Paper text:
1, 4-Dihydroxy-2-naphthoyl-CoA (DHNA-CoA) synthase, also called [name], is responsible for conversion of o-succinylbenzoyl-CoA to DHNA-CoA in the biosynthesis of both vitamin K1 and K2. It catalyzes a multiple-step intramolecular Claisen condensation reaction involving two high energy oxyanion intermediates and two keto-enol tautomerizations in the formation of a naphthenoid ring. In addition to observing the folding of the active-site loop into a well-defined structure as previously seen in the substrate analog complex structure, we have identified a significant reorientation of the C-terminal helix as an additional conformational change caused by the small molecule ligands.
There are two hexamers in an asymmetric unit of the [name]: HNA-CoA complex structure with their three-fold axes tilted with each other at an angle of <5°, similar to the arrangement of two hexamers in the asymmetric unit of the crystal of Mycobacterium tuberculosis [name] in complex with acetoacetyl-CoA. All subunits in one hexamer are saturated with the ligand in 1∶1 ratio and overlap very well with each other with a rmsd <0.18 Å over all Cα atoms, whereas only five subunits in the other hexamer bind HNA-CoA and no electron density of the ligand is found in the sixth subunit (chain D). The other structural change is a significant reorientation of the C-terminal helix (called C-helix, residues 260–272) of the opposing subunit by an angle of ∼15° towards the enzyme active site. The unliganded subunit has a disordered A-loop and its C-helix is bent towards the active site of the opposing subunit with the small molecule ligand. In contrast, the liganded subunit contains the ordered A-loop and its C-helix is not bent towards the empty active site of the unliganded subunit. These structural differences between the two opposing subunits provide unambiguous evidence that the observed conformational changes are induced by binding of the small molecule ligand. The conserved active-site residues in [name]: HNA-CoA take the same positions and orientations as those in the previously reported [name]: OSB-NCoA structure, despite the obvious structural difference in the small molecule ligands.
Residue numbers in the entry:
A (entry chain F), B (entry chain A), E (entry chain E): 1 to 285
C (entry chain D): 2 to 89, 106 to 285
D (entry chain C): 4 to 285
F (entry chain B): 2 to 285
The structure:
Amino acid sequence: MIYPDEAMLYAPVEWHDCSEGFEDIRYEKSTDGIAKITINRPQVRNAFRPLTVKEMIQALADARYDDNIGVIILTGAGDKAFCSGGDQKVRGDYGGYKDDSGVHHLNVLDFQRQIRTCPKPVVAMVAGYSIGGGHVLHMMCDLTIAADNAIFGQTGPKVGSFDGGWGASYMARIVGQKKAREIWFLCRQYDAKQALDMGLVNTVVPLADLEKETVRWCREMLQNSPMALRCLKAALNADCDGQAGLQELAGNATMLFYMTEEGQEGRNAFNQKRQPDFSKFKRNP
Amino acid sequence: MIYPDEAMLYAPVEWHDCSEGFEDIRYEKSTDGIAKITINRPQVRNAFRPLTVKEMIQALADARYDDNIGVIILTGAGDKAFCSGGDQKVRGDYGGYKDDSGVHHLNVLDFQRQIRTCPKPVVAMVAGYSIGGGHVLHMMCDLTIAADNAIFGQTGPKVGSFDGGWGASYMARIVGQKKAREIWFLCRQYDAKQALDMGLVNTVVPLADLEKETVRWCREMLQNSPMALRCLKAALNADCDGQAGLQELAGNATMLFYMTEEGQEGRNAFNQKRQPDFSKFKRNP
Amino acid sequence: IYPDEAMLYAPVEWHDCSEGFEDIRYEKSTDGIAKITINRPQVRNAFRPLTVKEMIQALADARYDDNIGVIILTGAGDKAFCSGGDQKLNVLDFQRQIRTCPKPVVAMVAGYSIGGGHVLHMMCDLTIAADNAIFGQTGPKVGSFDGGWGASYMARIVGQKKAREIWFLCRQYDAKQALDMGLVNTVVPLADLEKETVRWCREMLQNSPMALRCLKAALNADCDGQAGLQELAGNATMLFYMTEEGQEGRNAFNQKRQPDFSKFKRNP
Amino acid sequence: PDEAMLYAPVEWHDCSEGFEDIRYEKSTDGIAKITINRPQVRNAFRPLTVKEMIQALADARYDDNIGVIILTGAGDKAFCSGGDQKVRGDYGGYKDDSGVHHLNVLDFQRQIRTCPKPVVAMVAGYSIGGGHVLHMMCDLTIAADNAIFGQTGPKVGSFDGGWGASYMARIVGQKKAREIWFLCRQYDAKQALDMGLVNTVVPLADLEKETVRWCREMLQNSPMALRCLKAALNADCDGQAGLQELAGNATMLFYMTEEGQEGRNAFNQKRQPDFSKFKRNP
Amino acid sequence: MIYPDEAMLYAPVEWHDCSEGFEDIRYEKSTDGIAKITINRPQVRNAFRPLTVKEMIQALADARYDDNIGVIILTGAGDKAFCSGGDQKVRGDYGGYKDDSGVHHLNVLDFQRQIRTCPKPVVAMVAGYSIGGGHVLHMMCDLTIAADNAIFGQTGPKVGSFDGGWGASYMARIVGQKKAREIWFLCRQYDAKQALDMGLVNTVVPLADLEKETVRWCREMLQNSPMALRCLKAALNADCDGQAGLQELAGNATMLFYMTEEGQEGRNAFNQKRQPDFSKFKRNP
Amino acid sequence: IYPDEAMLYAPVEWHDCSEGFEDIRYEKSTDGIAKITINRPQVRNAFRPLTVKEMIQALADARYDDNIGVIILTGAGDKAFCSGGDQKVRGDYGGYKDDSGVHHLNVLDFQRQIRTCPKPVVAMVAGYSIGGGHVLHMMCDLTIAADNAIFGQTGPKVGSFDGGWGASYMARIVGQKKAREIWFLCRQYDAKQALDMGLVNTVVPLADLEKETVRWCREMLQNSPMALRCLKAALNADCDGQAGLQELAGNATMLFYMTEEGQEGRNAFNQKRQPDFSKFKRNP
Ligand SMILES: CC(C)(COP(=O)(O)OP(=O)(O)OC[C@H]1O[C@@H](n2cnc3c(N)ncnc32)[C@H](O)[C@@H]1OP(=O)(O)O)[C@@H](O)C(=O)NCCC(=O)NCCSC(=O)c1ccc2ccccc2c1O
Ligand SMILES: CC(C)(COP(=O)(O)OP(=O)(O)OC[C@H]1O[C@@H](n2cnc3c(N)ncnc32)[C@H](O)[C@@H]1OP(=O)(O)O)[C@@H](O)C(=O)NCCC(=O)NCCSC(=O)c1ccc2ccccc2c1O
Ligand SMILES: CC(C)(COP(=O)(O)OP(=O)(O)OC[C@H]1O[C@@H](n2cnc3c(N)ncnc32)[C@H](O)[C@@H]1OP(=O)(O)O)[C@@H](O)C(=O)NCCC(=O)NCCSC(=O)c1ccc2ccccc2c1O
Ligand SMILES: CC(C)(COP(=O)(O)OP(=O)(O)OC[C@H]1O[C@@H](n2cnc3c(N)ncnc32)[C@H](O)[C@@H]1OP(=O)(O)O)[C@@H](O)C(=O)NCCC(=O)NCCSC(=O)c1ccc2ccccc2c1O
Ligand SMILES: CC(C)(COP(=O)(O)OP(=O)(O)OC[C@H]1O[C@@H](n2cnc3c(N)ncnc32)[C@H](O)[C@@H]1OP(=O)(O)O)[C@@H](O)C(=O)NCCC(=O)NCCSC(=O)c1ccc2ccccc2c1O
Ligand SMILES: [Cl-]
Ligand SMILES: [Cl-]
Ligand SMILES: [Cl-]
Ligand SMILES: [Cl-]
Ligand SMILES: [Cl-]
Ligand SMILES: [Cl-]
Ligand SMILES: [Cl-]
Ligand SMILES: [Cl-]
């Protein structure tokens, strides 16, 4: 197989700001098809409050619908933290995190599903702490590129929380059941080499090379078939998500079927008020 | 167990219009907590175009976030059709249904997921045809109340489409594998009695009684525990949706854990920069 | 719009393709139906290893004949569809072959469908039963069991209470009982059995063969884990190959150049 | 099975010594019967009741003369009304005499599930709430014409989102399961039969007579085949826990073969095993 | 996150004997909440006979119901073996291991289920051989701490047995399918480093420090929320055990619901013979 | 307790069974190993529909030969194991074209055949295992890799994908993070990289590839064939839902037939009596 030149992979990146209207995040797009979502609350180690999550959902929705975007990067502002999870300062007694109107949210669950069902690869670019809900977020991303200063772990049993959804089951599909139980039960911190050794991240690079390397990985994907990528992502989800995974995988099959003459004949016949004739389309074995 | 007040179930219903801004649907709310989404394209048997689906998504999102709403009804305008599925007149060659900007969508998949993950019961109120994607929509709703004039079925293999996601697997969890294969492979139409006999709808009533009966069922649910309902809906999805189902079910467990003193101690300790003391909370077996 | 009943109930012209077979008949109609008939009425159409080998061969032929769109499985005579394994484990291979067949398979049942013969009708996508049809398992009565698709898939048809009843007691069930529990798709008078079955086949023969195979795979996928994903994804690959985007990948490789996927717009 | 055998008289030997909340009885032809005996509270279970039911079911499992177990309630008015609400504490469960909070019916559910002998629910009158989940968990349900079924969770501030939800759906389908749980209606015996929730409905006066007939039909059959099929049917629901049961039965069968035994013998005789004598099947 | 002091983690441990009545095992409890079950048949490399398993089941049940116990350690007596599986000297022809009365048991399957469903973490403390059924036992434990002399492997295909239950499927969820097939098909032995590298154990420590390090890990968990731990254990089981896993996870959710005012209102209304009133409890989104 | 190394590393005697095959070689050892070798080195051992048909035929023979206990799959030469579907014959109409113009995806049949084979199948990989050829080594129960082996997928680059066992089952081997990397980027991985991620069972010098593979086969050949087939089914059952249950339960039925209780139906028939199951003591 022929491969892309490293010179192109390491070409300069031109980012354009698309952050207007956002208070808690930055949102940027490169000319060559990368969207970057940056949590921008470094004073609280990039913890998310409900507003933060709402903005991330809005940005990811925009990235999904922009046909010039092929890959999304999720990251945190600064070098100290990717994300430290839900903002404990606004965590209420009544079953969620409080917004300024007093409504209690667990809206990161919506963002998790949105990352999961996104037909474009999402890459976590991790510098410093990826902890708690912030650790589940990196796990949800298809790939994780980690700096050598990255630190990983959960804190639920120490802070009176837990993610028993994708935070548990999907973690096990990454690091295996023994390591998943250790990570959750003891709530230790793991350095970048430890994370790499257990298969929790895809690669570790020096912090100075983090963005350069991440952009390289994104560009490798951008050279590939977007249709193939979305089908494979759905197929990999389908090993985990039961009928919800089937919904994604089968939905892509329908999309492909619509592009065939056989599928189109069914539509055409209905619009033309006649019976379809599928006899011209030979049956494969 | 004491029973609901029968006279109360049949009290008059006061609807308020919330349709401002919508072109393809109506959206209404009752004073006692029912939201009603009505597809309003009877000239095409209430077939949905991408705009229709976008509007339904917006209304369901509003219903989810309105804490005064406890149950949602999905229905079609007029008595002739609930929904005839995707609008074939705008179905493009390029893998989806075309909006006025020429973008190709399969956004009913998003709407399916939104119904699935909605923590409030969604009730399909079916008069006349529920066909194709419109049949999958009634199936996705938690309950279906059918008029005696209701007609059910798929048309995919006749019209050059298929829903191999929840439209297939989840149908089988309702009517069984033999009936599911019949429904999909032959694309016949089934009357209301046939649908009831196979467990495809919850009840059949005369058309004249359809809204009255639907409102009664909604009111029975509205007097019950909203927390129990959302946990049970998640638990029933979890028999189908693998890790995506675990995400919903465990997420509700987290919400409940946040309401306990043990959970709150973890938050409090973190905010107060001290170690938590969980020893006061006795271990159940 | 639906096909005319005059067409659905038109006469059927069968051609024999049974050369070489000792235990079965194999026939094909002009309009795309293949029919496999277990032909051992003297033993209530029980299968022996040769029978199973022949059925596999016939079904393999039907799969590869692009003129065939639907397969009927049935027994010779009016007394039995199949009474299972011969009294005096390759049927598992035959079960798998029915499951993975990209064409609909219809069980046409007159009289007894019992034991391994009962699991066979269940494996078929649809079952059309005559009013004299009788259904049930016998394993626990004779010291056997089918704990594979014979158990789990049975439960996906009739539900868990009835599956346990059917297996634990080994009663016989008449056609009405089977219909009521969702075990068969329809019941018709014995004299009309083939006539109605052919109608059902012809209704499917009017529909998209690609859609049918995708849906069959999708329904299998609710049951068969990664093996089901293999079928469903495999059809997706087949479709992808028919697209310009897929073909560009092939063309680029053969032309020893990098592919350019940029003309193929990203759908949301 | 002819009628003389299926409808032979029904006689019981009492084995209830030591129990406060249940009766436990055995027949000569291989049936054990566990009867919840708290009719004054519609046969609601308190933690002691569940502990006793577990003890009785364990006894039935280990008694090689027993092939089938019947679960039922005393009197004609109730099978079981679920957890005893009078002793339900604030701290996450039902309180015993020590003040410990239990949800021990979950242990009893798992024990019915993994029991290698068929368990049959014999239902007269109310099977409601946790009592309804109990009939669903039994392999078969025989209902009297006076039987009434339903859940009450969303009305009583509880839910069974385990086998009470998912397994119900495998019986009545997802539409009916959501109706049963969300509305908390009661369903009569005819309604239950029509939706497939029970296996048969019989006149109340004939309830035990018919239940015992069903038991006797199973008792004529292979106990090993039954336990393998029960495991196989659980395996369609219970993932690896189901695989544990099904494969466990395969191990038991393998131990009974000469091939399996050669391995043991070789180890005990401190030599290499020789499996060459045993032909490889396709 | 603040972590416990190492001085506390490595403080001496004081054990109290609770072995009265046991013939094949020891059972001990520490003042700070650890229960330890020790197989005591070193003359047969700590192989279990049916009595051994019955005793282990009794001890584990005691640990589950003792509200002062938060973590359980499973181990073997001496330094040479953790457990060598079923006692082949008492394995009968008739489908199981014989007790002194001649009844044939496979009761370790009950013990596997009991470890699985135990709401407290169970830790395998492994010195020397963990082989056959004894290897499955370490795998079933939530975590495994191994001494540098530990040896791991299966022997089924060599001794005429197999564990195709959790011994196969769950092994694959720990070490992956390639290694699971290697381990089972060839029946080799693996040293502690090999086991660590494939993710089969959580850590490897010097033999002299085995209990010291194990007690440290236990104490780290004892500082954490017992409710969070049991929910996460159930959640991780749920990725494997289908509806049986849902029973555990949902059961914990019910327990939490019982602790809420909303749940309690339902109980109260029933006990007071009145309609429940759930209107005071706001619906979260 | 364990076998002798002298026996494990003894010479191997192969006899040819390739008569009739155009695209593969097929050989059997005296001690119970069958070896299927793809023989199209000029296309890096890429398979066309005929190649797959022949491999299916050979594997069926090995399955049915009771003298065979283990099967090796490998490629001819040292440069390639298999490079996947032959792109030179890949048609527009949904598959790879044979000489008659029929479009096939018959490697899917071969995948299922390897999966359901009751004997262990071992991938012996020298050089490239790429694309459909990479899925094939993954499907094999074990993979022994030479130090020159190269692994990877190319789907998104060549306009294809295997979203069946090629995706889900890969994830059960290397985990979800690495599976997504392997598929999304289509890089190549060397033998060390593959070993480190758990994609292969061992890496050995190329000169020793067959010697070590035969040793692994011989270690399995000394073990119980029944236990091995039950375990293979049990391990498939963690992945394949009801299809996996079919295999596992089918083995249970076979075992049951070997017991007196299982035989009671046959015996009753021959003795002209009704079966009596009351006589068999119930285990708990
Ligand atoms: C390991 C650190 C990330 C960094 O340590 P470091 O020593 O560098 O800094 P530190 O001094 O702790 O923190 C700096 C400042 O940031 C703040 N901060 C850090 N993390 C958070 C945070 N998560 N929330 C609020 N404030 C935070 C600190 O309070 C402090 O600010 P200050 O009070 O001085 O003004 C540490 O800050 C830490 O342990 N943070 C807490 C992590 C944590 O427990 N997160 C919540 C876990 S649970 C969760 O995320 C979550 C969310 C949504 C869920 C939805 C459904 C189901 C489950 C969910 C869930 O589990
Ligand atoms: C429909 C009945 C069964 C019968 O109606 P009926 O009108 O004939 O009789 P009733 O007058 O209500 O009852 C007669 C007496 O029995 C008592 N009783 C009936 N059921 C219960 C009961 N369940 N608990 C305590 N007392 C009960 C009544 O209080 C009353 O006693 P009294 O005041 O005269 O002294 C009715 O009594 C009734 O609705 N009972 C309550 C049903 C109920 O809500 N059960 C609890 C559901 S939740 C549950 O069971 C459960 C248990 C364990 C779980 C574990 C893990 C996860 C979930 C769990 C779970 O959801
Ligand atoms: C059985 C009816 C519902 C009613 O018959 P009736 O005789 O009463 O009325 P009819 O005369 O046919 O229709 C009245 C008018 O409505 C129009 N109409 C009805 N349904 C549709 C429709 N679905 N699309 C466009 N026009 C429709 C007719 O064209 C006609 O309008 P006109 O031509 O006079 O201007 C019939 O109209 C009918 O078969 N309609 C087509 C149903 C159909 O095939 N729908 C699409 C199935 S597939 C689909 O929905 C779908 C959508 C999204 C998906 C996303 C992911 C994966 C799969 C998806 C999917 O499969
Ligand atoms: C590698 C060793 C663990 C240690 O080697 P070492 O060289 O240090 O010691 P060794 O000389 O072999 O043994 C010392 C003494 O202990 C005895 N011993 C060791 N293991 C066992 C043992 N498992 N049973 C009985 N005796 C044993 C030896 O016989 C010997 O006793 P002695 O002759 O002096 O009186 C070796 O002893 C050994 O391979 N033992 C056998 C391991 C084995 O095959 N276990 C059974 C596997 S299958 C299993 O466990 C099992 C159980 C329940 C199941 C239930 C359901 C489904 C499956 C199940 C299952 O697969
Ligand atoms: C990395 C190599 C294996 C070796 O590189 P190398 O540099 O050593 O050699 P190269 O010069 O590229 O190749 C040598 C010769 O072999 C040929 N060749 C190698 N592989 C293939 C090949 N796969 N098809 C056709 N020709 C091939 C080359 O064209 C060339 O021949 P020539 O033109 O000079 O006559 C490279 O040749 C390569 O990338 N080959 C293509 C691999 C490839 O994309 N395979 C198809 C992936 S998709 C697939 O396998 C597949 C199959 C069935 C499926 C069924 C259901 C669902 C999915 C399926 C599926 O995805
Ligand atoms: Cl920055
Ligand atoms: Cl956390
Ligand atoms: Cl009109
Ligand atoms: Cl449709
Ligand atoms: Cl069903
Ligand atoms: Cl309830
Ligand atoms: Cl073993
Ligand atoms: Cl590929």
